[PDB]
Amino acid sequence: PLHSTM
Amino acid sequence: CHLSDMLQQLHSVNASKPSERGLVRQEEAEDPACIPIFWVSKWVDYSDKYGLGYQLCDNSVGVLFNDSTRLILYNDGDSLQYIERDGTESYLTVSSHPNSLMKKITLLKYFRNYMSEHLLKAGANITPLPYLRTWFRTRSAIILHLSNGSVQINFFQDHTKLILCPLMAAVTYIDEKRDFRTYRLSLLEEYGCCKELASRLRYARTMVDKLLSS
Ligand SMILES: *[C@]12C[C@H]3C[C@H](C[C@H](C3)C1)C2
């Protein structure tokens, strides 16, 4: 992923 | 930066084969007094152009730029700390800063605004300034090494996380259901743990080796 969890 | 101590701590626990016990008593290894003060609650990998942005559990935010410099914004929303590649620390504010830092400050603001409005906050239901010294990502996790010696490993597929704190010789594990538990590594060695956590700790040792080899 490119960012932490949504 | 305490990495050698952490490696020894992990080696000891892993060598004791914690998941291979007549009776695993993981709960007996918990130690509420070792709960970490800081951990990374959110992050954004924009390293293709600027760097790694992140938020700490106290709502402060920071960025480890591609040029190896760091900019941290305290949770008061104005106090700032700049750390050069050499580690030289400087202090200022969003309202009073040198023009040379305008770009990096604007970039941090963008990161802050985004993380503040998006993404879940890790460890939100837990009540606990360092900067990000080093970070890297593997195919299965992101590894974050803080200046206070802590090492955090977030696993991508199942969302589990480890927060290793060498001063306390402790490790916090956040499982899939977001249960937040802090353990003393010496007690995990004595009482054991489940196969899942044992596997994460073996992986952690390998990640620490990487931080040492870097
Ligand atoms: C990340 C790394 C692999 C696992 C998952 C999905 C894809 C491949 C991107 C996160």
Side-chain angles (χ1 to χ4, degrees):
Chain A
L2 294 182
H3 56 67
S4 57
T5 302
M6 302 184 126
Chain B
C1 186
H2 309 87
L3 286 175
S4 293
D5 293 321
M6 184 180 291
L7 182 64
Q8 178 61 290
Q9 296 166 3
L10 288 167
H11 174 69
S12 298
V13 178
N14 294 343
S16 79
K17 307 201 292 186
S19 67
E20 292 184 48
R21 309 305 177 77
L23 176 59
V24 168
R25 299 166 60 189
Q26 193 174 315
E27 296 86 354
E28 298 275 29
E30 284 175 44
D31 189 333
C34 295
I35 297 173
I37 302 177
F38 298 109
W39 64 84
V40 175
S41 46
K42 300 180 176 182
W43 61 264
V44 295
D45 180 358
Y46 207 177
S47 67
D48 284 59
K49 296 176 181 299
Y50 307 114
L52 182 74
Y54 64 88
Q55 172 193 280
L56 292 183
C57 63
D58 73 327
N59 283 173
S60 64
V61 297
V63 177
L64 171 42
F65 293 104
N66 290 329
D67 66 358
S68 300
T69 59
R70 305 90 172 176
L71 191 63
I72 292 69
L73 177 65
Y74 287 78
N75 62 28
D76 60 19
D78 187 55
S79 301
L80 287 166
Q81 172 176 172
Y82 184 64
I83 304 81
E84 295 169 54
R85 189 183 187 301
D86 175 59
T88 304
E89 306 178 5
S90 299
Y91 293 100
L92 44 292
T93 66
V94 178
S95 55
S96 176
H97 60 276
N99 235 303
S100 63
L101 285 174
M102 189 62 229
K103 176 179 177 58
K104 285 175 170 172
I105 286 176
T106 63
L107 285 175
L108 182 51
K109 282 184 174 178
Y110 164 66
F111 280 116
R112 187 191 65 181
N113 283 45
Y114 182 75
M115 294 184 283
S116 172
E117 210 69 60
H118 314 69
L119 319 182
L120 299 175
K121 181 176 177 177
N125 282 178
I126 291 68
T127 301
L129 191 62
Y131 59 81
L132 185 58
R133 173 166 172 162
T134 303
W135 82 278
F136 68 81
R137 54 186 300 153
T138 64
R139 189 64 167 185
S140 63
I142 181 165
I143 293 66
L144 309 148
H145 187 197
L146 297 179
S147 62
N148 64 179
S150 293
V151 169
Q152 183 169 328
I153 303 173
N154 283 195
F155 294 88
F156 305 144
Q157 290 191 42
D158 61 18
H159 311 293
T160 55
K161 310 180 179 59
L162 291 175
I163 302 160
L164 296 148
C165 304
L167 299 175
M168 295 270 83
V171 61
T172 293
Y173 183 50
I174 299 176
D175 68 23
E176 27 281 296
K177 48 183 171 56
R178 285 204 287 285
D179 192 354
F180 186 118
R181 294 290 168 60
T182 298
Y183 304 98
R184 302 224 65 155
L185 287 167
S186 67
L187 296 179
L188 281 172
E189 173 166 351
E190 182 53 30
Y191 297 105
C193 66
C194 63
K195 297 182 74 298
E196 175 177 288
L197 180 57
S199 179
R200 301 285 181 294
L201 292 177
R202 288 198 296 279
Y203 194 76
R205 183 269 154 70
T206 304
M207 294 305 100
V208 171
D209 281 327
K210 289 180 62 62
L211 286 172
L212 284 164
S213 182
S214 65

